[PDB]
Ligand binder design. Structure first.
Ligand SMILES: *[C@@H]1O[C@H](CO)[C@@H](O)[C@H](O)[C@H]1NC(C)=O
Ligand SMILES: *[C@@H]1O[C@H](CO)[C@@H](O)[C@H](O)[C@H]1NC(C)=O
Ligand SMILES: [Ca+2]
Ligand SMILES: [Ca+2]
Ligand SMILES: [Ca+2]
Ligand SMILES: [Ca+2]
Lengths: 276, 57
């Protein structure tokens, strides 16, 4: 245990495999499911928590090791979603006009974000590169950004007139805003009800997987227009009955966990880098 | 003295008899499994108070 340093490992390409770890991942981890309240509404039952738990036990997950966490809806769940858990699954009923909100939430939760504060009232901010964004979270975020010259004079906006400022996000719970990189900006965001953080994009967060229950592939986690990839952890499924959705989850839970993996930053291996 | 472990493994079948004994010894209870579905509490009725049946003549 030699934390912190980046030491080069070495391995032989002729060694053999080892015994499967399926038993361990069932018997030690904790599965964790987030669903919308309309799920329980359509279920209209209420020992169904116990029913699902026992089905999970048949699949191999001990009784106390599977957690359920109802959330109201996508927009109100995206406001600081804390996945303090071990193997996270997030169901999302796709609906029209929530494409960007759902994609923002997926981008927020499926990747490790390193966030520093932002004192809007005092400093003028910047974006180091493509890996930097500003995530605003609150009850009502209305980010108004005014870019600046090299001499601290606004362009397309006056530094004193929030009317002249340009609106980039308006009255949404979660706003992962990007702007031009290398241009100082002056922000105004309603500080009493919407915090904002200057965040950097680390590697991917394998701990959580997203399940779009509704329509077609839309989730563009990569803010770059060019690349719109399809990650293994962005799963999609059709549906008419929430019972059928949950039974599919339980039946294929081993495959879902195979798609996912333990958080890289939750381990002692990542102790002195950005462990959390 | 290595045969202690061999003997315990070989004779382990007697723990079934021991389990039967402790089962006979132990007192027992059971459940009356609870009902779900009090999802609709019910009020009395629309009730209005009035004087009874006056006995006129
Ligand atoms: C690996 O699994 C096989 C059967 O699945 C078992 O016989 C073997 O003992 C296991 N390996 C070890 C080191 O126990
Ligand atoms: C944003 O603009 C409003 C006026 O619309 C102003 O009252 C408020 O102080 C501004 N926010 C900040 C952080 O300066
Ligand atoms: Ca303007
Ligand atoms: Ca949003
Ligand atoms: Ca940028
Ligand atoms: Ca993209």
């Amino acid at each position: 245990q030699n934390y912190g340093l980046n030491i080069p490992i070495t391995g032989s390409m002729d060694t053999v495999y080892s015994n499967s770890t399926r038993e361990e991942v069932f018997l030690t981890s904790t599965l964790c499911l987030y669903y919308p309240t309309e799920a329980s509404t359509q279920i209209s039952d209420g020992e169904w928590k116990d029913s699902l738990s026992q089905m999970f036990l048949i699949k191999g997950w001990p009784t106390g090791s599977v957690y359920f966490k109802e959330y109201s809806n996508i927009v109100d769940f995206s406001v600081d979603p804390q996945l303090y858990c071990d193997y996270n699954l997030v169901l999302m009923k796709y609906d029209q006009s929530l494409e960007l909100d759902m994609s923002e939430l997926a981008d927020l939760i499926l990747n490790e974000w390193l966030c520093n504060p932002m004192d809007i009232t005092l400093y003028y901010y910047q974006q180091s590169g493509e890996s930097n964004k500003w995530i605003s979270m609150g009850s009502s975020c209305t980010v108004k950004v005014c870019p600046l010259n090299t001499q601290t004079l606004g362009i397309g906006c006056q530094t004193t007139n929030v009317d002249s400022f340009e609106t980039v996000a308006e009255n949404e719970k979660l706003a992962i805003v990007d702007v031009v990189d290398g241009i100082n900006h002056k922000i105004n965001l309603t500080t009493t009800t919407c915090t904002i953080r200057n965040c950097k994009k680390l590697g991917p967060r394998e701990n959580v997987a997203v399940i779009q229950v509704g329509g077609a592939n839309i989730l563009d986690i990569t803010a770059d227009p060019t690349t719109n990839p399809q990650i293994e952890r962005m799963m999609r499924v059709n549906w008419k009955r929430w019972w059928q959705v949950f039974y599919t989850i339980v039946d294929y839970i081993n495959q879902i966990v195979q798609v996912m993996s333990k958080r890289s930053r939750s381990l002692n291996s990542a102790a002195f880098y950005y462990r959390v | 003295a290595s045969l202690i472990y061999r003997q315990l493994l070989t004779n382990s079948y007697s723990v079934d008899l021991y389990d039967e004994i402790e089962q006979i010894g132990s007192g027992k209870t059971q459940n009356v499994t609870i009902n779900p579905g009090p999802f609709a509490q019910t009020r009395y009725a629309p009730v209005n108070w009035d004087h009874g049946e006056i006995n006129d003549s």
